[PDB]
Each structure stands twice: as C-alpha cells, then as structure tokens.
Paper text:
LapD is a c-di-GMP receptor that translates changes in the concentration of this cytosolic second messenger into cell-surface events via an inside-out signaling mechanism that ultimately controls cell adhesion. Specifically, c-di-GMP-bound LapD engages the periplasmic protease LapG through its Per-Arnt-Sim (PAS)-like domain, preventing it from cleaving the cell surface-bound large adhesin LapA, a protein mediating cell adhesion to multiple substrates. In contrast, c-di-GMP-unbound LapD adopts an autoinhibited conformation and loses its affinity for LapG. To address these shortcomings, we report here two structures, that of the output domain of a LapD ortholog from L. pneumophila, also known and referred to here as CdgS9, and that of LapG in complex with the same output domain.
The structure of L. pneumophila CdgS9Output (residues of 22–152) was determined from data collected on a crystal grown from selenomethionine-derivatized protein by using single anomalous dispersion (SAD) phasing (see ‘Material and methods’). The asymmetric unit contains one molecule of CdgS9Output, which adopts a PAS-like domain fold with the highest structural homology to CitA. A potential biologically relevant dimer involves a crystallographic symmetry mate, burying 3020 Å2 surface area at the twofold symmetry axis via favorable interactions (estimated ΔGint = −20.2 kcal/mol). The protomers form a parallel dimer, with the termini lining up at one end of the complex, consistent with their connectivity to the transmembrane helices that flank the periplasmic domain. CdgS9Output adopts a ‘parallel’ conformation as opposed to the open, V-shaped form that we observed in case of LapDOutput. As a consequence, the tryptophan residues (W125 in P. fluorescens LapD; W126 in L. pneumophila CdgS9) that form the distal tip of the PAS fold and appear to be a main anchor point for LapG binding are farther apart in the P. fluorescens dimer than the L. pneumophila LapD ortholog (50 Å vs 35 Å between their respective Cβ positions). Taken together, the cross-linking data clearly indicate that the topology observed in the CdgS9Output structure represents the biologically relevant model, which is conserved in the two LapD orthologs, LapD and CdgS9, despite only moderate overall sequence conservation (31% identity/52% similarity). In the apo-state, the output domain dimer of CdgS9 contains central four-helix bundles, either via packing of helices α1 and α2 of the PAS domain fold close to the distal end, or helices α1 and α4 at the membrane-proximal region. Closer to the membrane, a cluster of 4 phenylalanine residues (2 per protomer; F33 and F34 of CdgS9) stack in a perpendicular fashion, as opposed to the packing near the distal tip, which involves the burying of two symmetry-related arginine residues (R75 of CdgS9). High-affinity LapG binding to the off-state of LapD is prevented by an apparent surface mismatch.
Author numbering:
A (entry chain A), B (entry chain A): 22 to 152
The structure:
Amino acid sequence: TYFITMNNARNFFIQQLESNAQDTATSLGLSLSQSLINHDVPTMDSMVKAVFDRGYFSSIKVQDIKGKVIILKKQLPQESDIPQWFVNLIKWPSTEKSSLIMDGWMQAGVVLVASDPSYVYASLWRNAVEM
Amino acid sequence: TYFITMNNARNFFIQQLESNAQDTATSLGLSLSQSLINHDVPTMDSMVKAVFDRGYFSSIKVQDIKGKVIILKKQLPQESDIPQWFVNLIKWPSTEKSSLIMDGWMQAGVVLVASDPSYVYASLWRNAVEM
C-alpha cells in the first residue's frame, strides 16, 4: 500500500490554498473591471458570490482606489469536532492575495481574496492514519 | 507519524480537479458575458489566458450558441519520468465541465473547461511512500 505523509499533504494544501486565492483574485480583477467602472454593484456581487459560495475563502473584498469597500463577503471558521491537539499539529495562518482592477492602463480598484485554512482541517483529520 | 493513504489522496484530486473545472467554467461564464455580446475577442482571450496559464487544464473552449468555437486553448499531457506501472495505478479520465454564457435571461454562449489529471501524477509519484 502507498501513502503520503501528513507533512507532505499539509505542504500541498498550504501551497494550493495560497495560489488558489491568488488565481481567484487575478481572475476577479479582470472580471470586475467593466462593472466597477460603470458602478454596477449587483453584477459585481454576482461575480463575487459565485466565487465566495464555493466555501473555501474566509473573505473577499472589493474596493476602489481610496480603500472604499464596495463589496465585502466574510465567514468565520466555525466550531469543529476536531481535537485541539490535532488542530495545533496541522494549523497554519491565512494569507490574503490581491489583484488590481484595471481600466485599460489606469488603476480603478483592488480585489482581495483571503484563504480559509480551517476549511481543510476536518478532511485531514478524517483521513489521517498513524504509523 | 501521520499519513494519508494514496487512495484517499487520489480521491481528493479526482474531486478537486472536477470541481475546479466546474467552478472555473462558471466564473468564466459570468466574466465573458459582456465581451462575447460585443464580440471583443482580445478581452475574452485575456480572461481565458489568465485561467489557462495556471497550467491545470487540458483545454478551455469558448463558443457561441451554434457551436462556432471562438477561443480554444489546448495542451497535451507531456512526457513523464514516471514509471508506467505507477501511472496505471493512479490514473483516471479527464472530465469536461460547462457553463452557459448569458446575456440577461437569453443564452449567448458556452464555456467548457476540461481537467488535466496527468498534471498531478508526478507530485503523487515524488511524494509516495510504500508500507
């Protein structure tokens, strides 16, 4: 039988969650351009909600140049039946990734996507085997 | 030391690659709407290239109602230093996911995203431990 060490599986999720937040922010940066320029909040909300409803993100933030937050989706990590000792073994901090929302060559806004590491803890706990 | 079985790690990637292709297709479906309506091929190409340059996809296809392919990005799985016996152990077929490109309530096109399972084989091979 073949296995993967917990340490290597953890390194995958650390890297995957970080790059997924960046890739998501970059694609939202292109997707939101026209709606941000024309101040179409409902269209911007649909694009963000489609991404945030995936469930992997702790926060998604859209703001114009000044820092004026236009859209803000947030969720907390919630209660867990995972033992705290195992949570302390695998946990790692969340990282926020950004991408500029452009209007041609001019800056128009920023979209920020933050990962939710606690989204993966339960799957690592249920699939863990000790040897 | 904690481990994950190869079978459980494989089930994760089977599920993750399939849902990632679907989530990507759905977000592209919203992102490409205005450009498809106004027939802005360069803007559509930038949105697709940002997603396809990620490297996880075997193909991304944008077409109007009729099946007229507007954008087509493809890549083959390439040569591997992975032994064929291990490739046969973990391999699984690619799946194509679709999302409609809408213009309000009217249909305008379809975007199709296909996964590339062979993208993950090398990482599973380099991280594999037998017990």
